[model samples]
Target: DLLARRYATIGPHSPLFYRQPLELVSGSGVWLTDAQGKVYLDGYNNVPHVGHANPAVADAIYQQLLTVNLHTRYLNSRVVEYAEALLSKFDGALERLFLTNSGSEANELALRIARQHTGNTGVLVSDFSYHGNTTSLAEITTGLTVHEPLGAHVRALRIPDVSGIAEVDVPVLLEQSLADVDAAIASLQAAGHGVSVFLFDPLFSTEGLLQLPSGYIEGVATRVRAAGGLVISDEVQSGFGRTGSGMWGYQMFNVEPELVTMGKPMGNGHPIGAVVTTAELLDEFGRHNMFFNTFAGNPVSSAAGLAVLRYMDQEDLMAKADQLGKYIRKRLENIAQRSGNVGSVRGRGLFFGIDIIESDGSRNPAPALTKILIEDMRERGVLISRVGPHDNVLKMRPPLVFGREHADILLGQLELSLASLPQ
Candidate 1:
């Protein structure tokens, strides 16, 4: 009754998972317990990077709540310390910071700065990519994929096809992708909306969780910059050691972003997001318009962010993610080899996309099979989800603190789930 009433109040914009939605009562490390006391292995949530109900982060938030929770207008040491801690991860790459309460707001601000810097209205992004929910970002995203562009100024480019390529053909694939980027820019310029921003999600999360060719990112930036556009790296899904190898997704790809937007894992499930960029872009935007976010950069939020970062370092979560991410992928690959339904397994660190396909080696996406698979996994006390335009790739973005034991549970449940499929 409570669930039904809650669902009645909420609109379609917020959809619950499964025909039987879960009623989670509480969570700890990598486990979530339902109202009925059924514990689940949390294989899909990345927001609580350190793990759910982490004592250190919770204590930090509690202490700050008791002390101060004021916004940016006030002098707050907590915010400054948090900012410094965040920037330190960049090693002097991004020099300015703007904190927000969510990834959408961070993306909105990044887009605003990009337009301000270039003095143009046109923006380019990849197909099937989702940036945020704001009007501008949504418009840009729609224009790039699915529906028609909200206006004439938005353009979309095809994500580079790295599918099933041998090791040596990587450079060739990158060249083709770069050329497509160049052509897209030319088309945007020809349309009279000279490019303002070239924005991208480094992991290509929605486009089947792709790991692009090594130089593809640099090439895009090089092309966009030469055409008088700025680049914004949307690291909302790929930052903070979630990618296993680096603090930011752009670092893994070796692309220097003029502006980077982050959220999700930054505050360990706390609603805090940020836009990191160069001082020059901020200076340009600040002169024209004053920017402020209500409830952003508050003391308690900063404390949460700070504690999360500290915990990541203290736990050496990056190296752990790198090591364990490889282990998980290898096991997933073995599963793929064994199960005809399992197509390709691709991911880095804790983020992964297992392509569900037909048994015949055809590249057709299996949406119905994915739906069934997720339900089976849920029934077996494991929680995971799916993404991509077709919703066929099984998405697993667990917490940073996830270890070998958690991996084994996930793999075991997955194998059982696969075994349950029709013979």
Candidate 2:
């Protein structure tokens, strides 16, 4: 499986060593360019939502740089534009936005804030959900390609997904999942640890969209809040119309969260993120005195972020995602016919999971086959990758502007990639 090239050339510690020996120098829209200018269609990245290097977003940044000096201390229009526009897409109860330089810091800050609000210490997370990679965040983010230490600074329960209950009926499983959260919160209170925040990516993005039933998240949120705990929706992945819906993942679940963190798409490709919460929680942080950041709410990031929000609205990208998402799901079903492996495509909007279920209905992590499949597609000049707790799913969360034509190209190459698998 091209071991020699992989073993010697790539990172000594990087996980992508095997799948690519490829390099890129530039990008625009859905296309990426190699150092030599060979282009590849990008189905692999979830960042750069307005598409890599769109001139409108670029010019917006250039213009903002001319207008403001920078800093969150100053009341600037770009920062206000970013918060107002981005937060407008979400539920209104989330009034305060605490900007951060990176997603890791955002999540880390969210943890501190949740503890302050709830007056509890334990933080509940998904066993495989990736929020970020700081000490607190990494303790919670189990699925990243990093080393792990034994213990429970991050108290996580494995969210039910393909391997956990892939074959189970959605209704029955949702009841149990909500019940599990209910009991976990109850158990913690009894144990005196008392869960502070029940945090999760609403659809389990890294582990595929392990969607819950009607009122699923609503049920859990009620239980947690009643127990004096807060609902922390880690929308770092599934936020901003990625769910095919109009806004965040929690919207589909129908529960307003006490706190929410967002990254990746917030500043397009820039390393910017923020956590939004109620004024009550923010007032507590204010009492602590000086909870500001050096580069957190910098004007440049605010400029890029505002431009992205404008582009999404101006182009009606969310609607485009909804239309194309349905087409992609149906096509995934067609491609699944070629192999028993693509058991189902479970997700909404642009965030999709081509789950690779085994013949026996458990998760069959065919990473070797996936590597082959990915390489096969690369040769055809499209890009897509595997995502999920088991490494079995072909994750596709391309830009909101990714269309029917691009979906067709992805589907064709995906089908061929499946054929290349070691059946």
Candidate 3:
């Protein structure tokens, strides 16, 4: 009955997970309970960064709502406090930000800023990546199905993945990838668009959690800058301690980005996103455009964001993610050695994945088998999903609060699922 109601109201176009759509009714920490009272470990969600139904975030939001919630036209201490806390997490020229309601808005605004600053209409992105759902983003989008054709000003590069490749070939891969970048910039300039920005997710999560050869990112950044383009890191899925080594995914590299956009986990489930950049860029944009978001930096959203940062600091979730990520990677590597289905272990920190392959010795992607594994994992009381162009990489990003005990449960169930797969 509920499914019928949802289909009638929201239409059938929007996708849902699993053969039998799950109806989760409640959640706390890294656990969820369905409408039928079946509990499942939350393993594929990042929007609830701190945890599901976090009382601190809920209380902060409630208190702020009880007091006042207004736009940035009025002075708001909560928003200022939130901004200060968030900026404290960044280093160097990344000292200013613009608050938004979602990753899409943050990315859209970042692209606009990049285009204005560089005075170019050209853009570069991974051939199989997604940034947002806006018109401009859709025109550049290559990961998902969109009715719009690829824009003339856009050039999609195939991101290099070095996983399972011989070490001797790494240098060749790096050189060729950077050459592709050079050709893309040249094509953009020849077409009269020039170069505006090369927007990307640092982890390349949507590209099957690609493992890039050394110096690939730095080389790309250098080349883009040389061509009068700015680098924009889309951290919608990779920021806010998602990657264990650093607060922002771009920090994993040596070169700094001119713009960094983030969302999904910034508000711990509350709708909040941001574009952080240098003070110079912020002031330049401010002088040219009178930009103001009605509800972006409101007191309630600020309170929610503040609570998330405060809780992360108090709990030291980032450090835990780092340690647990290494442990999980080791275990996954062992699982890969023992099983024929796992192609390679991928990802870092709390966000992780594995490439599924056929056991027939062909090493081909097994999207259908991956789907079966996911459905079986669900039947075994765990939740996971797949991604990548082949749709065979298991995506297992849980909340920041996920502990080792939870990891063991998920991994254990995964081992069972893999073993049970039809040979």
Candidate 4:
């Protein structure tokens, strides 16, 4: 009855997981409880990076609500303090901060800064990538399949061919990928737009969670820079210690981005985002246009974000994620070795994608197989989703606090789900 009501009232665009959507009422560390009193092992959303309903983060938000919750125009220590704490995680020149309501707003601000600073209109992105959901962002979020024509300024490039390439053919693949990137830049320049910015997720999350070679991203950055464009590290999905490399995904690559946008996990489920960039770029953009967001850097949201960072620091969640992620990856790899349906398991930290392949290691995406795994896993009390162009990569991005026990359960259920698939 509620499902039918929801479909009637909420419209069809807002998609929900599972055929019979579970009615989730509460969540704790690495787990969620449906209204029916069923507990699900969460292996899906990374937004609650510190864990859902985390006591510390909740306390911070609650305490702030008891106090003043003003905007950035007002002098509030919470916003400044959170900014300092967040910026401290980055050692590079991304010193200035612009807070927004979400990752889409952060990326929107980033695009503005890039265009303003470079005096160019062209933007570059991966063929399969998602930065944000705003209209402008949607134009560039080619991974989402922007129908009804894209703007003349947007250009989509192929993701670096790293994961699927043979070890012996790595050099050639890298060369071809570089060429693709360079050609995109040249094409944009020839179109008279010039390259304003080249934005990419360091983890390539939507591109089947393809983890790139460290040097590969740096090379792309170099090529984009040479083409008179700046690099915008869209760390919305892979930032805040999710990648296990550091606080930001771009750190894993040895490239310095002119703009770095982050959200999703910043507030541990609270809606808050920020764009960190150099002082010069911020000043230039600020000089021309005055920017303001109503609830972006509010005291409550800042407090929530700060609390998340503090929790990570106090608990050393980054180290824990790295340890657990390696364990999960190896276990998934073992499953792949035994199962013919599992193609590849790739990602960093607590985020991973298990590609459901057809027989004999072909890239032919098994969407039907992926559907079975997602549905079967949910039936077995686990939660995961799908990604990639064909919706075949089993997107398993559990919270950072996910430990060995959770990984084991996920793998066990995954193995059974695979075995249950039709021959």
* Winner by lDDT: 3
Q: Positional deviation of 50 in candidate 2, in angstroms?
A: 0.5
- In TM-score terms, which candidate is top? 3
Give candidate 4 regions above 4 Å deviation: 360-363
Ranking by TM-score: 3, 4, 1, 2
Per-model TM-score versus the true fold: 0.95, 0.90, 0.99, 0.96
| Candidate 3: 10-residue stretch with minimal lDDT | 248-257
lDDT of 1 at 311: 97
Candidate 1 at residue 281, lDDT?
Answer: 78
Error of 2 at 262 (Å): 0.6
- Stretches of candidate 3 off by over 4 Å are none
lDDT of each: 0.85, 0.75, 0.93, 0.84
The residue-by-residue lDDT of candidate 3 on 1-423, one tens digit each, is 999999999998789988888998999999999999999998999999999999999999998888999999989798899999999998888999899999999999999999999999999999999999999999999999999999999999999999999999989999998899899999999999999999999999988999988798999888888989999999999898988999989988887898999999999888999999999999999999989888899999999999999999999999999999999999999999999999999999998999999999899999999999999899899999999999999999999999999999999999999999887
Candidate 1: tens digits of C-alpha lDDT, residues 267-323? 888999999988887788889986778899889999999999999999999999999
Q: Which is the better candidate, 1 or 3, if ranked by TM-score?
A: 3
How many backbone overlaps does candidate 4 show? 0
Clashing pairs in 2: none
Candidate 3 clashing pairs?
none
| Least well predicted 10-residue stretch by lDDT in candidate 4 | 140-149
Query: Which regions of candidate 1 deviate over 4 angstroms?
Result: 142-149, 166-172, 361-363
